[PDB]
Amino acid sequence: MGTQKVTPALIFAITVATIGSFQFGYNTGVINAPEKIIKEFITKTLTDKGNAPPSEVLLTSLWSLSVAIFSVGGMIGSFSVGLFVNRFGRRNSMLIVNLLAVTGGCFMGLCKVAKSVEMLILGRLVIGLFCGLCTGFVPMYIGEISPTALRGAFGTLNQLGIVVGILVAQIFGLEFILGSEELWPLLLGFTILPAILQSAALPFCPESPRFLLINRKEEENAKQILQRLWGTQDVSQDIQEMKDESARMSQEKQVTVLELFRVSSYRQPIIISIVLQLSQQLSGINAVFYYSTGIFKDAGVQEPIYATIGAGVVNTIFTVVSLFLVERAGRRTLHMIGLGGMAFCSTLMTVSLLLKDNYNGMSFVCIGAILVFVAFFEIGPGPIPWFIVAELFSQGPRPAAMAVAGCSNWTSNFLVGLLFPSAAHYLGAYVFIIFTGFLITFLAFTFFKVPETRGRTFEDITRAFEGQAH
Ligand SMILES: CCCCCCCC/C=C/CCCCCCCC(=O)OC[C@H](O)CO
Ligand SMILES: CCCCCCCC/C=C\CCCCCCCC(=O)OC[C@H](O)CO
Ligand SMILES: CCCCCCCC/C=C\CCCCCCCC(=O)OC[C@H](O)CO
Ligand SMILES: OC[C@H]1O[C@H](O)[C@H](O)[C@@H](O)[C@@H]1O
């Protein structure tokens, strides 16, 4: 660190940014607990308007739309990240898009009194747009304001906000909290509250000093930001690194999404970036999490909701473990340990489910395998893919790269949700071997192809890719 310090100003800026992370986690998790209540809302709304009651097929299809349109919004929003952050700045983009959060939140909060299934769906779409933007904005901002020596640790706070968001959503989802037939619209509308808090705090957060110096050529203002954030007058090493990046950006053509795949020095890190997002989603994490309640039930958990909240707690604990290890073990090591551990547990899910009707003891192995799967997920594959894309690129290509990588993350999530039910229908317990196959494939990819980013400047990493390309 040298004379660099973790100041209250720095902790403030990072924590305020991760309110967006919290929003992504909350909106991801919140819809699941009130599924039956929301289906009753859809039924009653259709018949209140005079229609025939929907079949189970239509209810399932409208429920699935309500859930999945969030991912569609996220695909669009994440892909749009580059547009916003280069035009408005990183801090200013986070401020502006809270208009989407409050709007989507109000649509969801008002859909019941408006007796409108359309408003629920529109609300989920709009909050999806917002969350997709957040998943790119937050690790970018944190990556650009963090001291290099702590960039991974601070990057992991993005995922910590996400898993805290999921857990709070699960806890609120309880029937005696906000998950009642009465108040479920408030469960959804809750997302307006972190938006108001974040929006009030964001003006007092600095704009990215990298955006200021490199994109806007405001060296003096950037230097003063760093000096305050890092609690030291001496920031020459970092300013000169940014000036090197400014020279680079001035010497490279304006970056487009398509160019990322055409240029060898860009194609290596964008393929790494995309494959790392795939390793996160094609792990099956959201399928395992969503369907955990039913799997727990089938293995004999009498009160499955408590096991799923237990998973949410494990989810949080091991994100904190990752936080404390990622600068020591490095990104490569934690990502590989997580992928390998998940491959073991997903295989054990298949084996235990195949055996449990003959050997009941294997029921408990199944329950344990899901919990340990989540633990290994958060050791690396949860936190690292979101922030590592910021690390793999210099200032110029970073927004387009995070747009592409973030979109690939949301899109692969969408595909898992779309295809998993059919795959499970044909393969039964063997469906989890599909995730095992991906996990192993990406474990091999990570070992051979993913560079260690810990403690390295963006310019260091970029020069290394150019050297490999040459
Ligand atoms: C202007 C007044 C505003 C209205 C008042 C509303 C406050 C009540 C709702 C709070 C949402 C809770 C926000 C939770 C955000 C947590 C961020 C996070 O999870 O941080 C992870 C890690 O700590 C990163 O440092
Ligand atoms: C009504 C009787 C109770 C039965 C139900 C109790 C289970 C509720 C808690 C957690 C479920 C997991 C949700 C939190 C994690 C979300 C994982 C996820 O990926 O959710 C996406 C899914 O498509 C959704 O949108
Ligand atoms: C009707 C039978 C067809 C099957 C069901 C209909 C299709 C569902 C499609 C996608 C669901 C994806 C769930 C969306 C919520 C997950 C949000 C999330 O946490 O991830 C976002 C992104 O992946 C960053 O990680
Ligand atoms: O903790 C689970 C969450 O981890 C990561 O943030 C994923 O991007 C998200 O899809 C998942 O729901």
* Burial letters 201-210, b for 16+ CB under 10 A, else e: bbeebbbbbb
- Nearest-angstrom CA–CA distance, 29 and 138: 19
Residues 6+ apart with CB under 8 A from 418: 68
DSSP state at residue 280: H
- Nearest-angstrom CA–CA distance, 48 and 326: 54
3-class secondary structure, 225: helix
- Nearest-angstrom CA–CA distance, 153 and 325: 8
| Domain harbouring 406, CATH code | 1.20.1250.20
- What residue has token string 């892909």? 79
User: How many Cβ atoms sit within 10 Å of the Cβ of residue 136?
Assistant: 33
Around ligand 3, the residues with Cβ closer than 6 Å are 28, 60-61, 64, 67-68, 70-71, 74, 135, 281, 286, 409-410, 413-414, 417-418, 421
Tokens standing for residue 235 = 């920031």
Alpha-carbon torsion angle 23, 26, 27, 33, nearest 10: -170
Task: Count the domains in the chain.
Answer: 1
- Nearest-angstrom CA–CA distance, 321 and 301: 27
Q: What is the resolution of this structure in A?
A: 1.5
DSSP state at residue 428: G
The answer to whether the CB of 339 falls within 8 A of the CB of 279 is yes
- Nearest-angstrom CA–CA distance, 226 and 207: 11
- Nearest-angstrom CA–CA distance, 43 and 258: 45
Tokens standing for residue 288 = 């395992």
Tally the C-alpha atoms within 13 A of residue 145's C-alpha that lie toward its C-beta. 31
> In angstroms, what is the span from residue 451 Cα to ligand 3's centroid?
30
User: How many Cβ atoms sit within 10 Å of the Cβ of residue 257?
Assistant: 16
Atom of ligand 3 nearest to the CA of 406: 24
Alpha-carbon torsion angle 262, 265, 267, 272, nearest 10: 180
Closest residue to atom 12 of ligand 4, CA basis: 286
- Nearest-angstrom CA–CA distance, 376 and 295: 19
Using alpha carbons, select from 298, 288, 287, 433 the residue that is nearest to residue 362. 298
Residue 381 buriedness (CB in 10 A; 0-12 / 13-18 / 19+)? buried
The answer to whether the CB of 380 falls within 8 A of the CB of 335 is yes
What secondary structure does DSSP assign to 54-69, as a single string? PPHHHHHHHHHHHHHH
Q: Is the dihedral of CA 332, 333, 338, 340 positive or negative?
A: positive
Using alpha carbons, select from 279, 258, 261, 281 the residue that is nearest to residue 270. 261
Alpha-carbon torsion angle 228, 230, 233, 234, nearest 10: -150
Closest residue to atom 16 of ligand 1, CA basis: 19
Residues 6+ apart with CB under 8 A from 228: 7, 9, 206
Ligand nearest to the CA of 177: 2
Residue 204 region, left (φ>0) first, then alpha (ψ -120 to 50), else beta?
alpha
Tokens standing for residue 193 = 């509250």
Tell me how far CA of residue 240 lies from CA of 223, 250, 309, 454, in angstroms. Answer: 10, 15, 48, 20
* Method for structure elucidation: X-ray
Helices (H), 380-397: 383-391
- Nearest-angstrom CA–CA distance, 351 and 347: 6
Is any atom of ligand 2 closer than 6 Å to the C-beta of 438? no
- Nearest-angstrom CA–CA distance, 393 and 465: 10
What are phi and psi for residue 206, nearest 5 degrees?
Answer: -75, 150
> In angstroms, what is the span from residue 218 Cα to ligand 1's centroid?
31
Tokens standing for residue 289 = 């999490």
Domain of residue 13 covers: 1-470
Residues 6+ apart with CB under 8 A from 176: none
- What residue has token string 């999404």? 257
Helices (H), 30-116: 35-48, 56-79, 81-88, 90-96, 98-110
3-class secondary structure, 210: helix
Closest residue to atom 10 of ligand 4, CA basis: 286
> In angstroms, what is the span from residue 157 Cα to ligand 3's centroid?
23
Residue 462 buriedness (CB in 10 A; 0-12 / 13-18 / 19+)? buried
Length of the chain: 470
